[PDB]
Amino acid sequence: EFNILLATDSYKVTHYKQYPPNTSKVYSYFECREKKYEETVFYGLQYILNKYLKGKVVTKEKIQEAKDVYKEHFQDDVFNEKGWNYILEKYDGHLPIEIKAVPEGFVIPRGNVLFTVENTDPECYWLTNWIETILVQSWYPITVATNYREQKKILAKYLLETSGNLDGLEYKLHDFGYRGVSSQETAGIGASAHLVNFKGTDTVAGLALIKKYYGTKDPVPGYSVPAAEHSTITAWGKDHEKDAFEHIVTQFSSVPVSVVSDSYDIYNACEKIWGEDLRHLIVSRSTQAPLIIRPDSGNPLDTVLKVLEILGKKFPVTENSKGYKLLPPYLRVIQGDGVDINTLQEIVEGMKQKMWSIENIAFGSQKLTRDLLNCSFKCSYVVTNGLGINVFKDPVADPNKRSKKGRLSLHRTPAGNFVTLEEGKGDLEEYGQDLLHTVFKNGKVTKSYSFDEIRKNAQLNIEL
Amino acid sequence: EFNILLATDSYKVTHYKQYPPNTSKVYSYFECREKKKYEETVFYGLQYILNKYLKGKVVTKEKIQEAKDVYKEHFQDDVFNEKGWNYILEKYDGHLPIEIKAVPEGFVIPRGNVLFTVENTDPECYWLTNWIETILVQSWYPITVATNYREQKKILAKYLLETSGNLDGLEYKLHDFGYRGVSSQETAGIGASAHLVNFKGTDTVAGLALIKKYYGTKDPVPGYSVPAAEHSTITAWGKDHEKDAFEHIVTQFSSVPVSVVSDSYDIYNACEKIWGEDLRHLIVSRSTQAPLIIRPDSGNPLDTVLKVLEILGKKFPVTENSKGYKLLPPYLRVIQGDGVDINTLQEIVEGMKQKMWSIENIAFGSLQKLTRDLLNCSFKCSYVVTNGLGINVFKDPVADPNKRSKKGRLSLHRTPAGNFVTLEEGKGDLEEYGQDLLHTVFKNGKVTKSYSFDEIRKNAQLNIELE
Numbered sequence A: 001e002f003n004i005l006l007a008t009d010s011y012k013v014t015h016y017k018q019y020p021p022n023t024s025k026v027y028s029y030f031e032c033r034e035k036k037y038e039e040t041v042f043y044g045l046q047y048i049l050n051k052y053l054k055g056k057v058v059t060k061e062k063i064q065e066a067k068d069v070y071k072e073h074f075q076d077d078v079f080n081e082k083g084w085n086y087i088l089e090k091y092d093g094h095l096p097i098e099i100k101a102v103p104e105g106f107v108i109p110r111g112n113v114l115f116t117v118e119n120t121d122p123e124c125y126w127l128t129n130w131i132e133t134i135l136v137q138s139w140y141p142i143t144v145a146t147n148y149r150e151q152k153k154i155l156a157k158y159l160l161e162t163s164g165n166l167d168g169l170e171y172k173l174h175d176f177g178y179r180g181v182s183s184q185e186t187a188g189i190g191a192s193a194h195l196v197n198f199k200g201t202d203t204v205a206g207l208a209l210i211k212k213y214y215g216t217k218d219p220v221p222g223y224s225v226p227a228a229e230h231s232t233i234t235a236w237g238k239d240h241e242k243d244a245f246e247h248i249v250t251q252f253s254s255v256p257v258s259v260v261s262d263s264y265d266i267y268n269a270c271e272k273i274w275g276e277d278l279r280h281l282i283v284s285r286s287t288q289a290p291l292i293i294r295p296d297s298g299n300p301l302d303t304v305l306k307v308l309e310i311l312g313k314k315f316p317v318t319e320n321s322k323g324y325k326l327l328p329p330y331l332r333v334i335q336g337d338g339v340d341i342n343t344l345q346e347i348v349e350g351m352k353q354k355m356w357s358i359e360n361i362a363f364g365s366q367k368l369t370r371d372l373l374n375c376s377f378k379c380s381y382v383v384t385n386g387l388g389i390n391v392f393k394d395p396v397a398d399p400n401k402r403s404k405k406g407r408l409s410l411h412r413t414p415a416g417n418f419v420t421l422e423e424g425k426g427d428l429e430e431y432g433q434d435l436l437h438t439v440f441k442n443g444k445v446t447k448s449y450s451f452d453e454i455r456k457n458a459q460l461n462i463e464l
Numbered sequence B: 001e002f003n004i005l006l007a008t009d010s011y012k013v014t015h016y017k018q019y020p021p022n023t024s025k026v027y028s029y030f031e032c033r034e035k036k037k038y039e040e041t042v043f044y045g046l047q048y049i050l051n052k053y054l055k056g057k058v059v060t061k062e063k064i065q066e067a068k069d070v071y072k073e074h075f076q077d078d079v080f081n082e083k084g085w086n087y088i089l090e091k092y093d094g095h096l097p098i099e100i101k102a103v104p105e106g107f108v109i110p111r112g113n114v115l116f117t118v119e120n121t122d123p124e125c126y127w128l129t130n131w132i133e134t135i136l137v138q139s140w141y142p143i144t145v146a147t148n149y150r151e152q153k154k155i156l157a158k159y160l161l162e163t164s165g166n167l168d169g170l171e172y173k174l175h176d177f178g179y180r181g182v183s184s185q186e187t188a189g190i191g192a193s194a195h196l197v198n199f200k201g202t203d204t205v206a207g208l209a210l211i212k213k214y215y216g217t218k219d220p221v222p223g224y225s226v227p228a229a230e231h232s233t234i235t236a237w238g239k240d241h242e243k244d245a246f247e248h249i250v251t252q253f254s255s256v257p258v259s260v261v262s263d264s265y266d267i268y269n270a271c272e273k274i275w276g277e278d279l280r281h282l283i284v285s286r287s288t289q290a291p292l293i294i295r296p297d298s299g300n301p302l303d304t305v306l307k308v309l310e311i312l313g314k315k316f317p318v319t320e321n322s323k324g325y326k327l328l329p330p331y332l333r334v335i336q337g338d339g340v341d342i343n344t345l346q347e348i349v350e351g352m353k354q355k356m357w358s359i360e361n362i363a364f365g366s367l368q369k370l371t372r373d374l375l376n377c378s379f380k381c382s383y384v385v386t387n388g389l390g391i392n393v394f395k396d397p398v399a400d401p402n403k404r405s406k407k408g409r410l411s412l413h414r415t416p417a418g419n420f421v422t423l424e425e426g427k428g429d430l431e432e433y434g435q436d437l438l439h440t441v442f443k444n445g446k447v448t449k450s451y452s453f454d455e456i457r458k459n460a461q462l463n464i465e466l467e
Helices: A010-017 A045-053 A060-073 A081-091 A132-136 A139-163 A184-195 A205-213 A230-234 A238-251 A266-277 A300-314 A341-353 A451-457 B010-017 B046-054 B061-075 B082-092 B133-137 B140-164 B185-196 B206-214 B231-235 B239-252 B267-278 B301-315 B342-354 B453-459
Strands: A023-032 A039-041 A097-101 A107-109 A113-119 A257-260 A291-294 A331-335 A361-364 A375-384 A387-390 A409-412 A418-421 A437-441 B023-032 B040-042 B098-102 B108-110 B114-120 B258-261 B292-295 B332-336 B362-365 B377-386 B389-392 B411-414 B420-423 B439-443
Touching: A023 A132, A039 A139, A045 A097, A045 A132, A045 A205, A045 A437, A060 A081, A060 B206, A132 A375, A139 A184, A139 A341, A139 A375, A184 A205, A184 B185, A205 B061, A230 A238, A230 A257, A230 B377, A238 A257, A238 A266, A266 A291, A266 A300, A300 A331, A300 A341, A341 A361, A375 B231, B010 B061, B023 B133, B040 B140, B046 B098, B046 B133, B046 B206, B046 B439, B061 B082, B133 B377, B140 B185, B140 B342, B140 B377, B185 B206, B231 B239, B231 B258, B239 B258, B239 B267, B267 B292, B267 B301, B301 B332, B301 B342, B342 B362
Parallel strands: A257 A291, A291 A331, A331 A361, B258 B292, B292 B332, B332 B362
Antiparallel strands: A023 A113, A023 A375, A039 A107, A097 A113, A097 A437, A375 A387, A409 A418, B023 B114, B023 B377, B040 B108, B098 B114, B098 B439, B377 B389, B411 B420
16 A cells, blocks of 8 residues: 555655754745746646645654665665654544645746745645655646647647638547556546546546546546557458458548548558548538547658648539638548657648648657656745745856745736745735645645636636 | 456447457557667566456456446547457356466566567457557566666776676665656656666665565565654754754664764755764764664755865764775665656766765665656557458558557577577477477466566676675
């Protein structure tokens, strides 16, 4: 079973011995430090609070386990048994910590306080930074939610330009990343962050995480459609690709179906198999049940443009009100190979240049890290001998790693923007009310958001 | 509770209707595909997945009903193969009718070789082989982490041996600091265990618990750490009191090694004036078994290491070892844990060598952008039986010959020169190439062969270490 006492960086076990003696308060904060990606979607802390931090997280058994493990790990006794026993005895294993945070789904410029953490009992001054490691992992859903919002902005721009509207934007970037992430847990978290922005997903795990920790009015937050993979085409044999295609589109004749078409020759498949041999089975399909042709190899832009040029000559194309070419409603394309934010941008611009509407295409979804948005957790205020002091790092060779000082608060500016106030200056009351809310206190979650509210908070300006 | 019926790519739910009718067998394989350098990979991690996710009664009535309910809403249609899963529940008590054969864990195998194969053991479950692709393919991660760290160890070994004349301490030269930097708790355990295949120093205890539960070591633990400061334990003392913080910390940990981050305000002042003057007397009195380890954590990683060494070299007694390289006294060492990937690791050790500093002096602290594409980890169907006829199948996209897959039943063999070769089209059966190196590790819900973490470490050793 999960043990919070074994869920921290090893050296943090030794930190209670390193703070100034008579320290009663340690106060720390998380930011996406300021140096593309000028604003971040704050998302994912609520999962962490609920799965790992709330309730009786300390037991006699868990304390003994940590004692035994650290004894071998450090080859010495350095584990703070007494401190954890205090929390067990005094608070029935609930963490005497208060966490304040911006609402989930909030879109906030870099360099602002997003959450703060402090101990609520003088005896547990060491606890604030013990849980740094776990809370810092929020960088992942934040960065994923953020990156996908940025992709949506690009898609929205180009769909609006080529079509005159945003219809179907939420299905334009489908999550196919399940097998490409590092773990099952990561699959659920990352997919949920994707679903903040889009509705189309092949990663089931996202749906369950959302239902358990956030909640939606609807039965599910995300949807998929039948689709082929290379094995369901190749199993038929190299000479029977046409047979595979006919069987699949016939099995899925009244729902949308995606069919990977590059097993052997994408261009032949589009022009001769779909565009000739099986054409009668495609033109007869309903607008609610299109064939979605999926190329999956080659240069992403060149392949997409050639696939469209091929289909344009085999199927009736219209020109929409904005002047852009549009395939018939029973025929679409999905490109899910090598689509990152850069390649996404190159494809939609390339399509636009060739007078193809973004209506025609969807994308399928990569190496995001903690340094991308500079997600960082730092101590900014401590009380020692009853005196509060503002603390910070400011390394000489890197001004960008300078941290914020003292008690922090988040405020609306007179122009309606965000500003973080340092050194407890929030208390001067010149900038109105703190925009952070208490989300966790003494083992309990004190404020939470539905996934529906999170989606509303994360909307694009163009959608509003 | 984890439901295997919900642990696949959505579209795979629909594949039982797409395979050719009268298909009784689907046979699929995993490789780190060769690309037209990471020329060899450490196979590691499948055993975790087999035990955590695949073995035993993984199908229940409630799990089938849960999946049916979820899929009805997810697809806005009834596409779920309830009958097929019911069959596994009734006929096999919910155990998966699958056989998996794999190269031993820890094995170091050149790119483009079969590493494991998967096939159904019951004709009715032809669809099941690729249902579990998604979960099996996630093995890319421990494979790639274990491989990347082995490659970093190769570089460390080269330079340590050149500048010192031995490999002493090699297993503690790259410490795992990546806990906060990975995507999840589960990833933390898996990634740290793959690090531990190569090294012994770690701050991610998650990896220790995974190894103990899934692999096992003779020793109490596979990995170790020492006390260390963070910016908070230094800055909490106040801007004017860094010296006080340093003195306090080295005195609290006077008899064990201790790492102390020293760049809170000014790394070069801290090294020259605080450690190298004000507190010098507390450092030069330390035991060889209890060095101070100075930790810079900002600035250009090579520039900073070199300047730190130059500073310390002038404040402390340096010797020249038998190879002609400079060596700090034994009570003083440095760890660089900012921005160290494989490229920067090479640049630092090479830069140190050029400035006549031994690698004995330094240790490093560490994925970053490790992905499935790095080693081209891929799972592909290569053989089916339809209407009782075996057919060899594959993909071969016109615009990318690098994505061509292998054909037929596969086997892995030793070449006459002692290398590896994958045999396709069932040609292993000709028995011209000795025994198949793949072993059955999973069959019908049971793990059939397991490896200790001790064996895996043995298998993954460097040639330089064997010599």
